[PDB]
Amino acid sequence: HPTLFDPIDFGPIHAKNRIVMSPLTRGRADKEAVPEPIMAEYYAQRASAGLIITEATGISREGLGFPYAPGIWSDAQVEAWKPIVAGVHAKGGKIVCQLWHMGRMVHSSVTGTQPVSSSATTAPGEVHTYEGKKPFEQARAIDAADISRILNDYENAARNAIRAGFDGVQIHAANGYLIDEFLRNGTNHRTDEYGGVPENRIRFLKEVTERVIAAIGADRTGVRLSPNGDTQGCIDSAPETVFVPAAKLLQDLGVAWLELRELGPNGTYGKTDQPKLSPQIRKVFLRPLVLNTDYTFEAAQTALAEGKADAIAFGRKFISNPDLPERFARGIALQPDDMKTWYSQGPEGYTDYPSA
Numbered sequence: 001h002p003t004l005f006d007p008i009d010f011g012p013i014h015a016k017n018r019i020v021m022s023p024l025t026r027g028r029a030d031k032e033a034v035p036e037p038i039m040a041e042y043y044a045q046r047a048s049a050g051l052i053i054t055e056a057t058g059i060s061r062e063g064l065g066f067p068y069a070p071g072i073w074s075d076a077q078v079e080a081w082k083p084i085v086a087g088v089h090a091k092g093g094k095i096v097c098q099l100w101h102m103g104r105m106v107h108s109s110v111t112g113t114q115p116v117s118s119s120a121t122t123a124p125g126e127v128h129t130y131e132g133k134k135p136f137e138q139a140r141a142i143d144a145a146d147i148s149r150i151l152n153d154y155e156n157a158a159r160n161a162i163r164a165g166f167d168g169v170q171i172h173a174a175n176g177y178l179i180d181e182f183l184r185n186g187t188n189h190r191t192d193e194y195g196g197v198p199e200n201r202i203r204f205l206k207e208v209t210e211r212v213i214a215a216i217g218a219d220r221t222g223v224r225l226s227p228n229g230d231t232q233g234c235i236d237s238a239p240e241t242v243f244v245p246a247a248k249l250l251q252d253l254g255v256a257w258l259e260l261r262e263l264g265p266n267g268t269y270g271k272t273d274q275p276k277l278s279p280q281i282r283k284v285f286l287r288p289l290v291l292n293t294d295y296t297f298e299a300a301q302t303a304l305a306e307g308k309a310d311a312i313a314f315g316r317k318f319i320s321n322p323d324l325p326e327r328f329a330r331g332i333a334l335q336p337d338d339m340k341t342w343y344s345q346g347p348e349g350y351t352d353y354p355s356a
């Protein structure tokens, strides 16, 4: 019944509308993963979103291989995030930090360590580094000490996000990164309690989520999953058997909201024949469900009207339409985004898309 323009509560976050800015890596931080001041303008321009989910933000150097992406493990990073978050709040916006461990999707020339994963696998193709593209290296399967350390890193990152002023966090459990590499049977070949049957494959997500919620509260914790379709070499052969139980687990843990990146056979940023799991997940996760990928404004309105989702997150539309909610409301045409400047440096194709 609520429309995209009606408010929604994501835990304690009182969002003014249900038009969410999806997480978008842009590479406008520095080589120490410290946010740069231009990022304050970028997010402030987009503060009419009901909720902004930040670009994926590294919880550690081990888990952050993306050149010029920000982190949130250090005091210097927290201090740099503070004015970015404050500028959004000054405009009445709300913003959560997407906490990232990239798992096998890193190169050791950026992280200084071998890529880590559920199993000793290699992502397909080549990886974007500071020196250009390099073939992926084989990851190492994390051990018990690694798991303990990575949980500490998630805890520290969640506390640091709150200390920077973020309204909450979203756990990046999607897109073939570390958690997703445990969830899906295409990448998880472990023989211990983290591998095999779906309950075991969910265990790493469970333990990460439990540690984050014990630090900042389940009501300030959201999660992103990407249940259907190969992303970055990560797929499950029967996604319904693991992603529906994962969503039920998140519901039981008290997770405040769940975002699903869902592909289709004609997808324009990833395509697949695996069907969307949102109808099944909607039955087991009962708090706000945010859907994402290839939504026209009309399709987004239909999804809320038919009770399929509580809110819709838009990625590429927010790149090029900082005033997306106002354009929707006023019937104004949308500016196309320039993929050439998605991941480049500086303001071009970043802060120079005008509002209408």
Ligand SMILES: Cc1cc2nc3c(=O)[nH]c(=O)nc-3n(C[C@H](O)[C@H](O)[C@H](O)COP(=O)(O)O)c2cc1C
Residues within 6 Å of the ligand: 022, 023, 024, 025, 026, 054, 055, 056, 098, 172, 174, 175, 224, 261, 269, 292, 293, 294, 295, 313, 314, 315, 316, 317, 342, 343
């Ligand atoms: C340039 C770019 C950066 C992205 N960065 C992230 C990211 O940091 N974290 C994430 O979970 N998804 C990321 N994605 C996936 C988007 O959040 C979103 O799922 C995708 O753009 C499809 O939604 P859309 O059709 O509304 O654009 C990114 C996508 C693009 C194109």
